[PDB]
Amino acid sequence: MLTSVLVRLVAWSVRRPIWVVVLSLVIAALSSVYVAHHFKINTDISKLVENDPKWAALGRAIDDAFPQRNQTILAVVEAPAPEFAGAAADALAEGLRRETEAGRIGQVSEPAGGPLFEHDGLLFLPEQDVATTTAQLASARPLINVLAKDPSIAGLATTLSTTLGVPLQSGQVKLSGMAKLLSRSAATVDDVLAGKPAAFSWRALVDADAAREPARAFVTVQPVVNYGALKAGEQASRTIRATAQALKLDERFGAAVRLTGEQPLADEEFASVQDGALVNGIATLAIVLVILWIALRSKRMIASVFVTLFVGLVVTAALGLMMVGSLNMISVAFMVLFVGLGVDFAIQYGVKYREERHRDPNLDHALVGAAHAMGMPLTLATAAVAASFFSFLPTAYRGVSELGLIAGVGMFVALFTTLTLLPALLKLLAPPGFPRLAPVDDYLDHHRKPILIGTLAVVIGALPLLAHLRFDFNPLHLKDPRSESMATLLALKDSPEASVNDVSLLAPSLVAANAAAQRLGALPEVGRTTTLSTFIPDAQPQKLATIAAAARGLLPALTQPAAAPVPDAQRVAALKRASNLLEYASEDYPGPGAAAAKHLSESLAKLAAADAATRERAEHAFSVPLKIALNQLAMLLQPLEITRENLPPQIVRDWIAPDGRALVQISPKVVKGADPGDDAMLRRFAKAVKAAEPGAIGGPISILHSADTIIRAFLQAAALSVVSITVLLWITLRRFGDVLRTLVPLLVSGVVTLELCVLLGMPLNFANIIALPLMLGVGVAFKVYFVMAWRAGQTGLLQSSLTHAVLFSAATTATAFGSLWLSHHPGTASMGRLLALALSCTLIGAVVFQPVLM
């Protein structure tokens, strides 16, 4: 039988000398050589969830048709003013173009609008709005003339004083008509006095009020073609920041460049998972050391068990890397999982050898007897754990599949080690408790029996409170929101320029693509759909005629150059006269916004006191954006017509490049008050679009098929785990009464675990779904330990009981789960906390249900 075969194998290994130990040393050495030969850490996010051939048959079309989009990098510049943002964007674009021309990194693409888009930045609005804006600008011809001709801060103050003296007090213009401008200028001037980097905006006044304080301009670029052995993107991701810092945008424009995309997400994830490894390692080493010292007090044993743990670790790592050369950021937890789980066999053997020492005076006979004694329990625990881990193998989830393979092979290797190597190293180095717990020892075990009528009675009505659980169908949440790489994405949620929530759809032609865009816009929950045709303005002649009629009246008042700055003392006198006028106004002209007039008076009375260089700073912050905005309005006011034969090659290369006809990027409908911070409407949008047109796969919003796949895989894996564990128990406990005993409490404890997870409100996710079968196997192992431990009597678990070994194993597993909890990574922090809660509930569920285990 299994017991006889195993004791014969261990006794035949004993009949082999230290030869076994030196052979284990050589095998561990070559296994470590193989490990260091191929570590190969991978962090792919689309591999750990397999997809059916149908969705892959469209992902491959996405890849083959449009290569410059699946791996692109998006750069974001942030300036306190839109003009500075646009200037920084254009400078970064020309710099990256000069960088690419030499053949170092890929070509750049400017999404906010290319040369024709910037020259024609007025044809993309309805005729009414552009007509009103042009008429408004034409009405303001004298003011824009007297403003642009003297853009100096001194000249600006002078023209403000001259337009504040006679016009206001005349009776044609009220203070409140410009009080908004006055208050904004007062705030900017006060900021300049504070020395902080300030910037005034002239585009937020007359053109449009849709100018927010996080003024962002976006530029994208696809990474290097990877000529040789370059990392394919890291060089460019560094050169972007290098050229940005070299171009000196912090002072010339006062901005900040950011970078984001799947590649920097991967890099920051690599960094986050690697930095929280040394602390986790020292923590698990410390906890296993202290639990081994409290389990056994001897240097002749603890060292040997440490050697067994280390050799088990290295051999399981070698075999795992031999199976698959990747850890996928999820299977990397085996490094701590082995240390936290496989030490149970060693602790069990050590406690039983201590009991044998108390019993058997000899050491060889005591060791072989302790080996033959834990023959069936140890192997059954190993089988249960390995089955619970291998149940996830026939699923679509790849990450958990690899994790289960690694953990099962590691459990087999740990059994082999504890059986063969540990007794040899014991022979070669042949070597009460807690006298305090009496009060609870009296009356906390003798009330374990009515717990059956208390907890079961309070748990029945807890079934309706189980369905209040959500499921995170988007992996982006558990991606360390503290890093900038996705903090930029989180802040980008308001800007609709770069649509991170878009979907895609190909077509057999451009007209078919337009028809699909129309029939998908007919759905009341889509919003807007874009294609190559949407970059073609509708009515060219009328718009061009209106803008030409505005230009023929506005142009001659913009190109005229200014004069030179007068000396400084005259500027002080000008600001003094401006202060006097503004003070007289705010003192004898009270009304709605006279407080703004007093604020400007105070700002202009504190500005011109004794400082010199800060006034040049104020000039840099006032006149430069003014000239930028004026040049922009001048360029944008004499546009051309946009035709497909005149469209830039970059746009047509990004929308319909190949004979693989155009794609139609589709965004989700957004309404005021329903910001994209709501996953329910995104899921409904995805389902609606998928029902309308099936080929609309690829969008980060239509990733619900991944969640469906992983939930089906987890369901089938849990079913297979339960079936395998019960068939093992029944092939070992033939009369089904014992398997009912060993099982029913474990299912009850799993129900309790799910109920606690729903009460706390934490949802299950991609890497937080393995707790149920793992803890089921662990509890089954504990119950099959107990079915042999208390055979002599049902004594409480106090004062170094016969189950103190199992208690120490539980404590070690719990502390290892708590160490895996603190990992500075949500994808593992959630896993750790759920593992800890599951252990905490299933332990008492398998212990206090003693009438249903023996």
Side-chain angles (χ1 to χ4, degrees):
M1 205 45 188
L2 194 145
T3 64
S4 45
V5 168
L6 270 195
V7 62
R8 184 55 181 181
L9 209 68
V10 65
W12 190 79
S13 278
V14 182
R15 290 297 162 268
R16 302 147 64 90
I18 188 177
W19 199 8
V20 161
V21 178
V22 77
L23 191 151
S24 88
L25 183 148
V26 168
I27 294 304
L30 74 92
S31 277
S32 279
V33 160
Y34 189 78
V35 164
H37 212 68
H38 280 80
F39 197 11
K40 206 166 40 184
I41 295 184
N42 184 277
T43 188
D44 197 310
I45 195 75
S46 159
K47 184 261 290 181
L48 58 87
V49 169
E50 201 51 25
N51 43 6
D52 57 49
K54 184 177 179 180
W55 307 133
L58 267 300
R60 280 279 86 179
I62 285 294
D63 190 328
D64 186 301
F66 291 74
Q68 74 271 25
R69 197 193 188 186
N70 277 318
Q71 69 289 350
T72 179
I73 299 284
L74 163 74
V76 183
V77 298
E78 182 146 50
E83 301 92 351
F84 285 146
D90 290 6
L92 198 145
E94 50 91 11
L96 265 294
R97 277 166 183 173
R98 172 58 195 86
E99 183 68 26
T100 284
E101 191 96 340
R104 308 189 196 94
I105 81 170
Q107 206 83 9
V108 71
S109 316
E110 206 282 334
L116 294 176
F117 200 107
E118 301 282 339
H119 279 257
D120 285 28
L122 214 51
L123 276 74
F124 301 140
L125 284 176
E127 205 292 309
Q128 280 46 50
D129 283 348
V130 55
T132 70
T133 53
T134 44
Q136 167 186 359
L137 295 189
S139 81
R141 189 164 86 95
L143 304 185
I144 191 154
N145 200 344
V146 74
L147 164 66
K149 209 174 62 59
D150 300 356
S152 64
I153 181 67
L156 177 52
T158 317
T159 177
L160 196 58
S161 178
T162 44
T163 191
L164 198 78
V166 170
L168 168 64
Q169 304 176 349
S170 62
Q172 74 163 23
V173 56
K174 196 58 66 179
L175 179 75
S176 303
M178 307 301 182
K180 185 199 66 177
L181 173 59
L182 315 173
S183 89
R184 181 54 182 268
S185 81
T188 299
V189 162
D190 204 278
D191 218 331
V192 164
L193 312 172
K196 319 315 191 272
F200 183 84
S201 178
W202 295 96
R203 203 146 194 79
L205 264 52
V206 285
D207 290 332
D209 57 16
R212 286 82 53 188
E213 57 92 14
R216 303 199 271 271
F218 312 100
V219 285
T220 192
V221 54
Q222 65 99 60
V224 180
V225 63
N226 199 352
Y227 264 100
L230 197 144
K231 297 303 125 181
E234 169 62 34
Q235 173 77 10
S237 199
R238 188 194 305 180
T239 303
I240 284 188
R241 300 175 179 266
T243 60
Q245 186 59 34
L247 258 57
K248 316 299 170 55
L249 80 164
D250 59 356
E251 42 186 0
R252 204 171 74 170
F253 308 118
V257 57
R258 301 304 173 187
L259 298 153
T260 182
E262 58 273 20
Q263 173 164 100
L265 292 179
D267 306 295
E268 307 256 9
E269 281 297 4
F270 187 36
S272 46
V273 62
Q274 294 326 314
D275 73 87
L278 172 147
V279 53
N280 165 79
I282 65 185
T284 178
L285 266 62
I287 56 153
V288 68
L289 190 149
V290 296
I291 187 66
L292 195 43
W293 195 279
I294 184 175
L296 299 98
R297 279 82 63 189
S298 78
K299 184 254 293 180
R300 291 90 173 266
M301 284 264 157
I302 294 171
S304 44
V305 189
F306 278 170
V307 187
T308 70
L309 261 187
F310 212 85
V311 301
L313 282 164
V314 301
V315 186
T316 180
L319 267 170
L321 266 299
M322 212 185 208
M323 185 48 240
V324 62
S326 48
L327 305 185
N328 65 81
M329 187 265 288
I330 297 180
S331 296
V332 70
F334 85 105
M335 214 59 254
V336 68
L337 191 83
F338 186 91
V339 178
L341 179 46
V343 77
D344 58 351
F345 310 146
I347 294 299
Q348 186 179 359
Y349 203 88
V351 164
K352 195 148 215 323
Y353 176 64
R354 185 186 184 273
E355 311 298 7
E356 289 271 326
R357 153 156 49 192
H358 285 286
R359 184 151 321 170
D360 293 11
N362 191 284
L363 299 198
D364 183 28
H365 268 291
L367 269 190
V368 303
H372 186 286
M374 296 301 186
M376 264 176 184
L378 195 146
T379 190
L380 204 153
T382 299
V385 173
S388 51
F389 268 117
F390 287 169
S391 88
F392 261 100
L393 185 57
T395 45
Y397 210 106
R398 185 62 64 182
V400 174
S401 161
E402 296 166 317
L403 187 143
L405 265 181
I406 294 164
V409 172
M411 283 290 121
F412 286 168
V413 165
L415 170 148
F416 186 88
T417 285
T418 298
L419 175 147
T420 317
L421 176 73
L422 177 58
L425 279 176
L426 291 198
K427 301 174 211 315
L428 269 45
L429 179 79
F434 283 75
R436 196 266 307 277
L437 321 178
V440 311
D441 196 3
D442 309 284
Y443 300 146
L444 284 188
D445 41 357
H446 308 68
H447 271 285
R448 176 263 326 162
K449 310 176 309 170
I451 298 285
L452 190 150
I453 74 170
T455 299
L456 268 164
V458 80
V459 80
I460 45 154
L463 165 67
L465 207 59
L466 172 140
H468 305 162
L469 176 48
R470 199 76 193 168
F471 184 88
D472 284 11
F473 44 97
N474 42 0
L476 275 298
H477 275 283
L478 49 89
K479 297 300 172 56
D480 190 340
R482 309 280 79 83
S483 198
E484 57 91 14
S485 162
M486 71 172 263
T488 49
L489 297 200
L490 175 47
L492 211 167
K493 184 200 100 173
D494 56 340
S495 315
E497 194 272 350
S499 160
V500 290
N501 316 127
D502 57 6
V503 309
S504 309
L505 163 66
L506 269 72
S509 178
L510 188 66
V511 56
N514 289 14
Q518 177 266 353
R519 72 183 57 108
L520 280 151
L523 268 59
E525 63 276 37
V526 62
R528 53 159 185 82
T529 66
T530 79
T531 175
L532 184 58
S533 277
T534 187
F535 275 91
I536 300 298
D538 309 67
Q540 304 289 63
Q542 299 176 166
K543 278 160 161 283
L544 281 185
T546 54
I547 311 174
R552 68 155 55 186
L554 272 296
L555 256 62
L558 285 170
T559 320
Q560 181 64 29
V566 309
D568 272 327
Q570 288 299 328
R571 180 157 36 178
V572 193
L575 274 187
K576 185 72 160 53
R577 185 210 56 188
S579 176
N580 291 344
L581 270 296
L582 268 161
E583 181 66 21
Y584 182 73
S586 180
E587 272 182 325
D588 208 3
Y589 268 85
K598 176 56 170 171
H599 205 193
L600 257 186
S601 277
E602 295 319 287
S603 59
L604 287 189
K606 287 284 298 181
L607 196 170
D611 47 351
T614 61
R615 272 193 267 166
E616 275 190 341
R617 292 293 191 274
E619 181 179 1
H620 167 83
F622 268 102
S623 290
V624 176
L626 176 59
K627 294 184 179 61
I628 288 300
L630 291 164
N631 182 30
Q632 176 174 346
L633 183 53
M635 285 177 50
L636 192 136
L637 190 60
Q638 37 181 6
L640 217 57
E641 82 288 341
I642 290 172
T643 47
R644 194 187 194 279
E645 282 70 14
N646 198 2
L647 216 55
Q650 215 289 320
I651 290 300
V652 310
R653 196 63 161 80
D654 291 27
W655 280 125
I656 178 170
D659 295 334
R661 303 327 295 244
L663 64 91
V664 297
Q665 163 178 302
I666 302 156
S667 66
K669 169 65 165 56
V670 193
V671 59
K672 192 63 212 66
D675 53 76
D678 178 352
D679 293 27
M681 68 169 193
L682 272 65
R683 196 263 310 176
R684 295 194 308 272
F685 166 74
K687 283 186 73 68
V689 172
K690 187 70 71 60
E693 196 68 39
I697 177 65
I701 318 305
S702 180
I703 64 181
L704 77 163
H705 70 97
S706 67
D708 293 357
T709 298
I710 70 174
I711 193 166
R712 177 248 186 178
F714 159 71
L715 213 53
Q716 73 175 340
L720 292 174
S721 158
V722 171
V723 168
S724 160
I725 291 171
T726 186
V727 77
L728 168 73
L729 263 294
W730 200 57
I731 207 66
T732 70
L733 276 297
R734 179 68 64 192
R735 55 178 291 165
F736 73 103
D738 307 278
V739 299
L740 188 149
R741 296 163 208 275
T742 316
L743 280 163
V744 163
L746 275 297
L747 304 187
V748 171
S749 46
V751 170
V752 170
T753 304
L754 203 43
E755 285 181 348
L756 260 61
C757 194
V758 174
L759 262 293
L760 199 143
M762 43 174 299
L764 321 182
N765 50 80
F766 282 66
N768 198 14
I769 203 162
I770 67 173
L772 175 46
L774 194 149
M775 280 290 92
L776 166 59
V778 160
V780 164
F782 274 42
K783 294 273 261 199
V784 65
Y785 283 156
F786 268 68
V787 79
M788 302 275 188
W790 292 128
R791 289 297 305 117
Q794 281 193 338
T795 295
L797 287 83
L798 278 303
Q799 285 78 248
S800 180
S801 44
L802 306 96
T803 55
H804 208 191
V806 173
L807 173 148
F808 284 165
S809 159
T812 303
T813 299
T815 310
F817 287 169
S819 161
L820 187 57
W821 189 347
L822 278 54
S823 61
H824 262 297
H825 177 80
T828 64
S830 85
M831 185 166 47
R833 64 171 178 169
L834 178 47
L835 276 178
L837 171 147
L839 172 148
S840 199
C841 50
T842 189
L843 203 43
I844 71 152
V847 164
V848 310
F849 284 172
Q850 199 159 184
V852 190
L853 62 85
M854 204 180 308

